[PDB]
Amino acid sequence: DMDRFIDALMKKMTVEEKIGQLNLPVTGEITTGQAKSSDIAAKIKRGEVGGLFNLKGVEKIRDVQKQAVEQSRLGIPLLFGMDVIHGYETMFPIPLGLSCTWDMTAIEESARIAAIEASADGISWTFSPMVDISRDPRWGRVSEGSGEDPFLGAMIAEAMVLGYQGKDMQRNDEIMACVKHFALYGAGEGGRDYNTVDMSRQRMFNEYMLPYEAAVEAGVGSVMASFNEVDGVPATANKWLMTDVLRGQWGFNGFVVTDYTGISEMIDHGIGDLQTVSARAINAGVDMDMVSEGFVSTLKKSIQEGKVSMETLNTACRRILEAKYKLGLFDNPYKYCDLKRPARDIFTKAHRDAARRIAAESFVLLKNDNVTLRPGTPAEPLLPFNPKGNIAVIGPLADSRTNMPGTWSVAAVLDRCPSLVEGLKEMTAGKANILYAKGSNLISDASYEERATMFGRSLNRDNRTDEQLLNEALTVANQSDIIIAALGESSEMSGESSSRTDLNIPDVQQNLLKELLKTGKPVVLVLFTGRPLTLTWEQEHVPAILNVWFGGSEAAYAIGDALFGYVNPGGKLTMSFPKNVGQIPLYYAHKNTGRPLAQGKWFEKFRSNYLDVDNEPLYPFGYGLSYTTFSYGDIDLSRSTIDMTGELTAAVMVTNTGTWPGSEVVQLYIRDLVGSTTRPVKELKGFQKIFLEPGQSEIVRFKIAPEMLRYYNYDLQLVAEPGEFEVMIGTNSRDVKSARFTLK
Amino acid sequence: SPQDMDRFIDALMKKMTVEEKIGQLNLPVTGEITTGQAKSSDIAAKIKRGEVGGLFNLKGVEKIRDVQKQAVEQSRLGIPLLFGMDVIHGYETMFPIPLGLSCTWDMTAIEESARIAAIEASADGISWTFSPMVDISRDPRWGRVSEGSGEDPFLGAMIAEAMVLGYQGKDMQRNDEIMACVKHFALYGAGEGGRDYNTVDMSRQRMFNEYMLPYEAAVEAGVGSVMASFNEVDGVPATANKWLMTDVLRGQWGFNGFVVTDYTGISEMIDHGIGDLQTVSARAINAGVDMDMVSEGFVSTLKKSIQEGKVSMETLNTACRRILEAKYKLGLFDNPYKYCDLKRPARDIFTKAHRDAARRIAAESFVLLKNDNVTLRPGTPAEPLLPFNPKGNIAVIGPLADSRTNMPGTWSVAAVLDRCPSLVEGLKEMTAGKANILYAKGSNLISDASYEERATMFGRSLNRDNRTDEQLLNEALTVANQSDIIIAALGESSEMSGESSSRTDLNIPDVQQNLLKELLKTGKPVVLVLFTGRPLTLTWEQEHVPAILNVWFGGSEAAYAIGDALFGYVNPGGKLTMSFPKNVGQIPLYYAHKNTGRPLAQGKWFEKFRSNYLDVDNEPLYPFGYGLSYTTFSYGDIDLSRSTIDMTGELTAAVMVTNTGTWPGSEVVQLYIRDLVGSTTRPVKELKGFQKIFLEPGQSEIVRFKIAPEMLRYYNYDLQLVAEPGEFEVMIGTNSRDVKSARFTLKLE
Numbered sequence A: 001d002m003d004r005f006i007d008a009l010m011k012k013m014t015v016e017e018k019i020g021q022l023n024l025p026v027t028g029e030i031t032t033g034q035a036k037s038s039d040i041a042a043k044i045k046r047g048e049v050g051g052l053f054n055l056k057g058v059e060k061i062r063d064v065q066k067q068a069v070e071q072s073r074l075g076i077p078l079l080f081g082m083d084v085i086h087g088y089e090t091m092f093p094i095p096l097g098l099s100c101t102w103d104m105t106a107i108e109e110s111a112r113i114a115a116i117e118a119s120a121d122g123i124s125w126t127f128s129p130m131v132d133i134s135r136d137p138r139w140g141r142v143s144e145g146s147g148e149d150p151f152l153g154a155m156i157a158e159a160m161v162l163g164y165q166g167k168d169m170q171r172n173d174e175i176m177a178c179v180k181h182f183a184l185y186g187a188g189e190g191g192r193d194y195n196t197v198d199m200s201r202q203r204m205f206n207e208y209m210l211p212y213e214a215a216v217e218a219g220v221g222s223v224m225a226s227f228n229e230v231d232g233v234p235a236t237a238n239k240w241l242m243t244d245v246l247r248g249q250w251g252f253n254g255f256v257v258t259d260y261t262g263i264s265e266m267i268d269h270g271i272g273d274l275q276t277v278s279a280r281a282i283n284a285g286v287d288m289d290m291v292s293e294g295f296v297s298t299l300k301k302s303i304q305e306g307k308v309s310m311e312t313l314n315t316a317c318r319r320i321l322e323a324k325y326k327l328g329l330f331d332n333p334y335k336y337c338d339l340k341r342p343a344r345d346i347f348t349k350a351h352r353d354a355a356r357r358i359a360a361e362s363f364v365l366l367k368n369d370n371v372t373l374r375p376g377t378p379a380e381p382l383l384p385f386n387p388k389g390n391i392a393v394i395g396p397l398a399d400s401r402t403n404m405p406g407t408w409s410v411a412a413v414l415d416r417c418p419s420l421v422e423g424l425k426e427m428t429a430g431k432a433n434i435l436y437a438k439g440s441n442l443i444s445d446a447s448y449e450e451r452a453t454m455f456g457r458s459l460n461r462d463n464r465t466d467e468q469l470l471n472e473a474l475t476v477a478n479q480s481d482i483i484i485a486a487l488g489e490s491s492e493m494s495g496e497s498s499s500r501t502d503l504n505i506p507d508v509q510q511n512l513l514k515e516l517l518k519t520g521k522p523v524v525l526v527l528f529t530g531r532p533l534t535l536t537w538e539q540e541h542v543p544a545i546l547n548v549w550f551g552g553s554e555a556a557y558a559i560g561d562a563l564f565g566y567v568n569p570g571g572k573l574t575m576s577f578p579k580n581v582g583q584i585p586l587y588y589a590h591k592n593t594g595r596p597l598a599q600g601k602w603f604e605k606f607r608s609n610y611l612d613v614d615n616e617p618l619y620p621f622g623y624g625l626s627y628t629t630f631s632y633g634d635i636d637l638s639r640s641t642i643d644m645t646g647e648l649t650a651a652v653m654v655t656n657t658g659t660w661p662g663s664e665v666v667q668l669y670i671r672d673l674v675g676s677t678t679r680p681v682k683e684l685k686g687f688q689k690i691f692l693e694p695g696q697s698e699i700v701r702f703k704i705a706p707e708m709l710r711y712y713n714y715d716l717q718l719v720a721e722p723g724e725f726e727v728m729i730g731t732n733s734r735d736v737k738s739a740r741f742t743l744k
Numbered sequence B: 001s002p003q004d005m006d007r008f009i010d011a012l013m014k015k016m017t018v019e020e021k022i023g024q025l026n027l028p029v030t031g032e033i034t035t036g037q038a039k040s041s042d043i044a045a046k047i048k049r050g051e052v053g054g055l056f057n058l059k060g061v062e063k064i065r066d067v068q069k070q071a072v073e074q075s076r077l078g079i080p081l082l083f084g085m086d087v088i089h090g091y092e093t094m095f096p097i098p099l100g101l102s103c104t105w106d107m108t109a110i111e112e113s114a115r116i117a118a119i120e121a122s123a124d125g126i127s128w129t130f131s132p133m134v135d136i137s138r139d140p141r142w143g144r145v146s147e148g149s150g151e152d153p154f155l156g157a158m159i160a161e162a163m164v165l166g167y168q169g170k171d172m173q174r175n176d177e178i179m180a181c182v183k184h185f186a187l188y189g190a191g192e193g194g195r196d197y198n199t200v201d202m203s204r205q206r207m208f209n210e211y212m213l214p215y216e217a218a219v220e221a222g223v224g225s226v227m228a229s230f231n232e233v234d235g236v237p238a239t240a241n242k243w244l245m246t247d248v249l250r251g252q253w254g255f256n257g258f259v260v261t262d263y264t265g266i267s268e269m270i271d272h273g274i275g276d277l278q279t280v281s282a283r284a285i286n287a288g289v290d291m292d293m294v295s296e297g298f299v300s301t302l303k304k305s306i307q308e309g310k311v312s313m314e315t316l317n318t319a320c321r322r323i324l325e326a327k328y329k330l331g332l333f334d335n336p337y338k339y340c341d342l343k344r345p346a347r348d349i350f351t352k353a354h355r356d357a358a359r360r361i362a363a364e365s366f367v368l369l370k371n372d373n374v375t376l377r378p379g380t381p382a383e384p385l386l387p388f389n390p391k392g393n394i395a396v397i398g399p400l401a402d403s404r405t406n407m408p409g410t411w412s413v414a415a416v417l418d419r420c421p422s423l424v425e426g427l428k429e430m431t432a433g434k435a436n437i438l439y440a441k442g443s444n445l446i447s448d449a450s451y452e453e454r455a456t457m458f459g460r461s462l463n464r465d466n467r468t469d470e471q472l473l474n475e476a477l478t479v480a481n482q483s484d485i486i487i488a489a490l491g492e493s494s495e496m497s498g499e500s501s502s503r504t505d506l507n508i509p510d511v512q513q514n515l516l517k518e519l520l521k522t523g524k525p526v527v528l529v530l531f532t533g534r535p536l537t538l539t540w541e542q543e544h545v546p547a548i549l550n551v552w553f554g555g556s557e558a559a560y561a562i563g564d565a566l567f568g569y570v571n572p573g574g575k576l577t578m579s580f581p582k583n584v585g586q587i588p589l590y591y592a593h594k595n596t597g598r599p600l601a602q603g604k605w606f607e608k609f610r611s612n613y614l615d616v617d618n619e620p621l622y623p624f625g626y627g628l629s630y631t632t633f634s635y636g637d638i639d640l641s642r643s644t645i646d647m648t649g650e651l652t653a654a655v656m657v658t659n660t661g662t663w664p665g666s667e668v669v670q671l672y673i674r675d676l677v678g679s680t681t682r683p684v685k686e687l688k689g690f691q692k693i694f695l696e697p698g699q700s701e702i703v704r705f706k707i708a709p710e711m712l713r714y715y716n717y718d719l720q721l722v723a724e725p726g727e728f729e730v731m732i733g734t735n736s737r738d739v740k741s742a743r744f745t746l747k748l749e
Ligand SMILES: O=C1O[C@H](CO)[C@@H](O)[C@H](O)[C@H]1O
Pocket: A032, A033, A083, A127, A180, A259, A260, A496
């Protein structure tokens, strides 16, 4: 059926036309790399274009599809691609923030909505999800992932692929997804984007690979090859990755696209000239060439010289044609070119309300200490509070529209998003006064601020000095009843090519924060960030800290919802927050070492520890507070022993012991006590997000079976070994209840 | 003969019970030196029962002789003991810490320092040193960088050879030659977070191209023993890693010696999480580990394992034979008391000749990092602060100004710490009658007293008192404002580096940097004499201090050597062997890095969509091979004897180096090669040669390097050590950053 159709089409094709299906030039207003493609009208005519990307607007896409359908010899329709990462126009939180919902239904929903919007506007293909594991918060691209953990990363990868594609991409509101960046890109040395990656095969499989595999097994249509080398070979020329693992081991039936000029960049990597690396890429299992024109300009010559087989070419071409067929583009090239759809599907109130809900769900309450508010009274937390009197909103993130959506919002209308001040003004009209002061620049260094606010994120820095801005803010702060310090990163301090060697709140903002605290007014830190920051000073001195990541186009409203208690925060961290950059890499699923430092023993000579800080993150994986409290009973294991075909249930009663209704992410960890290789001190193996009224309890039950206990041993065999296991359940990866069982 | 050894050992082993064979594999700890937590007990009775193969941490020929006499006269078979110690950079005469010593780029001096240490150690009963430490590291957070020779495997390998040869000589036959022990096999310098003992993980390709060569070089130089490392490799503690300890070490490299564990390395595998004591002990001996340091895994569990078939008699016999062979090769069956001459210590230890050598080698190790011109007096053109004639009032200020015990450096376990002159003491002696040495402590080591305590353990107290920072600073400023020049003696205490001394920030500590700022504010000329066991983050100091001399830890004669440099008796010629980062967030920085697919071109920081950071450029403050002189050297263009060679060929790269300044001095001329295109990505350069030359003012020398295809080999994707045809770039210069370039082509034919 498909096979026969594609056989017949391919029998007609010239070598040039087969090669053309593998070519993906760039166009439009959206800029995601340096090199630009020329002469696109003619190339479509010559049959030399497989797809395009970065073109926005159903009408413009329709026009281009027409040229392909009507002006090329064979009429083969184009794929239309875009980075639809965490929204099209309705922007959800950045993926890292979104991961802190621990809510696969919400995550699927966000992808569903983005697909509806993008498909309504002509897009058939998104370069998403980004599933790279990272333990290095220096790397700006942590903003695009789902944190450090592969179990949670894998579940999220599945939710995103399903949200975008549905069952089989048959509907006109379903699009093809693309798991990226295969593979290991999050382990770039120094946290410096694009830098050398190196690790053992054992680490690859146990620690980094699961999310890519989960996407493949969820039926993801395409895979993007990464910029990094693996084992000294750029991923785009690594046949072990792109054929042996991807196809041979996991059974991937789709196609592989490069990242931006990934082929020609192999010249700079230092593995040969354009022809050589182009031939190596297609022979490795790469099917589509993003921008470099390596395939289109050199593959014929390589075929003539016997460096690439006609077989290899036909396979690459076939995979591209199968993707087009599966999307329904041969049945109808204009499947996604309904000019009536943008008006009914894009940036609707329904979509924006969903984004607002998901944003509030993504926030992580890091601290909410009791503060003396009125003398004589027992100390109470600052959050939540009723919007009354004068609310100061101060800082460089307080009145920026364009920094609200987050990095990788290329189709968003940035200056349509309400700033925090605008959203809070709306939400408190008639009830409180919102008093604004800028307070500081983003950072002292003007050049830094300029590059940190590129892609239209300017904060309109002017000639007012740090001291002037501070003084104005203190005048405002001292007229107020409470201070909302809106501080942290600009959105483009994270994302692609946005690596940091220092992870503090920037200098002038931290100074501003210190001065606001010195007023004696209550201070809430509303923290904008795309990554873990080093917050030990803020943890010591600020009473309340709400990590809002970048919450999307409706962030301002969601922040209001959290501050005023309309939503009780329930986010939990998915990446460790280190005390300093000298502890990197810090991650919860670490080996014990031969000289573990016992709890509370810092400092101890001859143990694995530092002279100047303990081994712990400030906030561990899975950490997050609520306006209520939860209490855990002891773990009930249904068996003390099981065999390889058996099973048990781990159960724990969770009680809401405070005064607020709220959600709790109950987290399941397992430690394999003894291994033929060293095993992590714990691994996340399940979770359940529960909602409880005050005083209400729920018995949370986890099924545990031997398949969950498997790991890649020294010989890379995926096996569960007999022995003892420790089951841990708790409110984060640090504070847990424990019980043990034996596998026979 | 080899056959005589086999016959003798065959005969001895025929006598031995299983318990006696197991006993040869047992290495308890005793004596006054502390290098770990666990301690041994009942050693006298254990030796009597034949349950002890060697001991370590026992100092003094009288004590060692007594113990050897018990082994020889009172055990059934009289098998003599090995006596081990960490003789790392000196016995009593202390040379610079190894990392400092590596900056001499002088293999003759390095060999000499090991020779002297062996002479002193052997005089005092020691037959075995746990040295050299040859671990590659790119992570200056790790305290043990102090013990190695930097980031580079080419230089690392040459130093490993020099050290082994210095200790052992041709074949350990002489009574002033001892058995060496290459450590820590393997990859221990890549521990995550720079945190000692932490997880190591890397590809096999990285192991062989970037980390393994120095171990291999020690093995090929005939090192008698290998110490297994604390870290895991491929998820297996090195002490249980049969691929490391058998397949690589014996299978690939032909190692003929024995493997000892590190301190309780076997029982620590329980904590690593790979099983109980019996299980991990069986795995260790089966892996190729021959001697058990302290844990008593072998002695307490091997017989049960042999009964149960978990370890074979053949495996026990092989391990025992290796130990007996080491003892045989050291001459201990010929004479158990070879090293127990009670009269040698008085004539061989801490002699003037030894100490004069140490003083010379210390001055040779220092790295001049900065020496800018300063205007001392209106109307006189500006000149550098260093060197200066000792006259007037010379202030020496800081917590490292008057500490004897912090001079030798970490890993000086046999030194008499309180006998080393302090810097003030040394400079006072050297300037008697010419200058007044003024002194103030100026600051504590660091603001936190608890930190200072752990930083000055092992008898390195700075005698911190309850004076306020104000008292300390005011006294220093009263000194500074009377002085003609200020020597700011700042940096680390010695035990801020070494084992279990990892740091997450690499600054000069808070109160010392505040002191430095205040001294600079006086307007008097300031020379930073920097004590450290590691690269530090020195961007502020490079911007603000006119002269910076890195003296590492120079050893027992450091004070005199520092005087030699300051007063111009020696012209500094040290070159860095490890990159100095601008901040900890750049780690790891190393010169021999891959290009990436998005390289930032020179001078283009910042550029979006290149491999670079938002907040700092990609560069270290000081690159690999960096070091200044009191003179300047200029380099002509490179002349290659031919532009094309094949696998059978060779060429010569030659460059004229001229001393263009006013001082005679040494230059380390460094050869780097870039393999431009590979089947795998190749580093942007690799050190492949060097020559240290001495030139008088105005003098020139043509420095020539032989380049052959064997130098161009590397491990490809399939771990084949191969040279590939293609273009190569030859670079020669004064450091890894500032170089001349020429190209040549390699063909198959
Ligand atoms: O450079 C890139 O370009 C791609 C196209 O914009 C994008 O999808 C990748 O995530 C990114 O690495």
